[PDB]
Amino acid sequence: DIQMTQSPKSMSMSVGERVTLSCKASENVHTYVSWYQQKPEQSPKLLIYGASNRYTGVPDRFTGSGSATDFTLTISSVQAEDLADYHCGQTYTYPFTFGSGTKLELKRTVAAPSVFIFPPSDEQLKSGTASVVCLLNNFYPREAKVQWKVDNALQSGNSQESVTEQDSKDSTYSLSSTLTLSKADYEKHKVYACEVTHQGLSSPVTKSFNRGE
Amino acid sequence: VQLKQSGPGLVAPSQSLSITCTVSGFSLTSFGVHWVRQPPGKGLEWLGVIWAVGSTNYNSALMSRLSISKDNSKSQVFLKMNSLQIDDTAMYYCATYGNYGGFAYWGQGTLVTVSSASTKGPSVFPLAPSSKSTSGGTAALGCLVKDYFPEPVTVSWNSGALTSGVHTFPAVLQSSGLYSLSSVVTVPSSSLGTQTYICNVNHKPSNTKVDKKVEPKSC
Ligand SMILES: CC(=O)N[C@H]1[C@H]([C@H](O)[C@H](O)CO)O[C@@](O[C@H]2[C@@H](O)[C@@H](CO)O[C@@H](O[C@H]3[C@H](O)[C@@H](O)[C@H](SCC(=N)NCCCC[C@H](NC(C)=O)C(N)=O)O[C@@H]3CO)[C@@H]2O)(C(=O)O)C[C@@H]1O
């Protein structure tokens, strides 16, 4: 019944820059506002409570301020470890509510992907299915296009991709694209290729194997 | 202070969930314990609380289906929810303010999936390193963890001793309705003949643990 709006929904900052996260309550919540840091694959951790109290063990670069309906989390000079989702919440009145979160992502120099390709294991083939995996390792920025070609036929609708959360120690991403075929279809073709388009590449790069080897 | 939760699992719609939160380092007769959940790709949602004195307060949008209870002598708090819908799928946390004004202590989370599908343990296939997964003095290898339900799985390498260079990708739901993910690691290409690489897969919903040795590819 009290609504917390966080802005922006995502941002990208360079290391050492000042970060400002905003949270706006739909009604006066006085100072009953907390900020939480959630790193991937972890529980939220308390950073600030009572709008401005820094919680135990939190680095001094995190500061909370604000009151009534407008609240701010600042990171005085952001570090690569500070990559996370940041949540604000109010505990002024029932029901307690939270904002939708702000994703903090880091900026770095453009980094092209290393591209690797993996044919299906022989154990999987015996089961009747074939997964071919294309890996894009340690690149930046996040945007990349992967296209599969089978005996030069451009594929569509038979692949899925996943992208890691940004790495906290080099600020890069990795991406896996998986092409799935029946074993019968896999065995009807020779060349399996993935072609990668990325800001860090002159021209699209292709990685391929031939089953006939 | 510690809050430890029971494990992830699957429940059918219209059925009911039950989660246990076991607390240590404080007493339930002195601190209230809350439950908060995070639905997929959404923010946190406060569910309710059982105070030290034993009274409860609930999120009014859900209170008809929610119950929070505790056993002081056993240091356990219980969340129960019935008439479940698909959109009750979420990471469920217990938490406490302790002595503070916000959620200062959190459990590790319990992933509850609401679905009519059955639990299925994963198939684990090697992503064998080859001339095709080598870039100079760096080779990549991995394991494909395929056809499991529900989330989550944990993937480690060499029982967890190997963490540098490891990327475990978020799972994707396949058109079959099962999940699939990969986990990869980059190693020195000269290490492929001298170092053992084993991926360890744990799927607690099916109480499955699998280890796959990943060897370089043959001819
Ligand atoms: C170590 C210790 O001191 N233990 C205490 C614990 C402990 O402090 C907590 O568990 C936190 O860890 O608290 C005990 O007391 C509880 C208990 O008394 C329950 C009963 O319901 O209430 C708990 O207090 C909460 C209030 O119920 C809740 O209303 C507030 S909301 C924040 C707020 N201060 N808002 C002010 C105005 C509210 C809006 C208002 N509307 C109205 C007035 O209707 C308006 N003007 O619009 O949060 C309180 C907690 O922060 C209380 O803590 C316990 O757990 O039993 C006692 C134990 O000794």
**Buried b / exposed e along A105-124 (16+ C-beta atoms within 10 A):** bbeeeebbbbbbbbbbbeeb
- Beta strand A114-118 pairing with A129-139: antiparallel
Residue positions counted in chain A: 213
In terms of Cα–Cα distance, which of B83, B115, B94 is closest to B20?
Answer: B94
- Phi, psi of A163, rounded to the nearest 5 degrees: -125, 135
CA B124 from chain centre, in angstroms, equals: 18
Query: What three-state secondary structure class fits B25?
Result: coil
Question: Resolution in angstroms, to 1 decimal, for this deposition?
Answer: 1.9
Residues B122 and B21: beta-carbon distance below 8 Å: no
A positions 127-156 inside 8 Å of B (CB): 127, 131, 133, 135, 137
User: Could you tell me which CATH class the domain A114-210 is placed in?
Assistant: mainly beta
State whether residue B64 sits within 8 Å of chain A by CB: no
> Into which CATH architecture does domain A4-107 fall?
Sandwich (2.60)
Within 8 A by CB and 6+ apart from B20, the residues are B5, B6, B76, B77, B78
Instruction: Give dist(CA B107, CA B153) in Å, integer.
Output: 18
Count of other CB atoms within 10 angstroms of residue A24: 15
Read off the amino acid at residue B147: D
Distance in angstroms between the alpha carbons of the first and the last residue of chain B: 55
Within 8 A by CB and 6+ apart from A66, the residues are A23, A33, A51, A52, A72
**Buried b / exposed e along B104-134 (16+ C-beta atoms within 10 A):** bbbbebbbbbbbeeebbbbbbbbbbbbebbb
Domain ranges of chain B: 2-114, 123-213
Question: Which sign, positive or negative, has the C-alpha torsion A56, A57, A60, A66?
Answer: negative
> Which among A1, A2, A93, A96 is the best mutation to test ligand 1's pocket, defined by most ligand atoms within 8 Å of the CB?
A93
CA of B49 to the centre of ligand 1 (A): 11
Count of other CB atoms within 10 angstroms of residue A42: 12
- CATH among 1.10.600.10, 3.40.30.10, 2.60.40.10, 1.20.140.10 for B2-114: 2.60.40.10
Residue keyed to tokens 């009534």: A68
Residues A82 and B133: beta-carbon distance below 8 Å: no
State whether residue A92 sits within 8 Å of chain B by CB: no
| DSSP one-letter code for B7 | P
Residues A166 and A83: beta-carbon distance below 8 Å: yes
Residues A128 and A183: beta-carbon distance below 8 Å: yes
Domain ranges of chain A: 4-107, 114-210
Q: Does the CB atom of residue B103 touch ligand 1 within 6 A?
A: no
Q: How many CB pairs under 8 A join A and B?
A: 145
Distance in angstroms between the alpha carbons of the first and the last residue of chain A: 64
- CATH among 3.60.15.10, 3.90.1260.10, 2.60.40.10, 3.20.20.80 for B123-213: 2.60.40.10
Find the angle CA(A158)-CA(A159)-CA(A163) to the nearest 5 degrees. 165
Residues B180 and B174: beta-carbon distance below 8 Å: yes
Tell me the three-class secondary structure of B59-106, residue by residue. CCCCHHHEEEEEECCCCEEEEEECCCCHHHCEEEEEEECCCCCCCCEE
Residues B95 and B34: beta-carbon distance below 8 Å: yes
- Phi, psi of B64, rounded to the nearest 5 degrees: -65, -20
In terms of Cα–Cα distance, which of A86, A78, A43 is closest to A59?
Answer: A78
Within 8 A by CB and 6+ apart from B16, the residues are B80, B81, B82, B83, B84
A4-107 and A114-210 in the same fold: yes
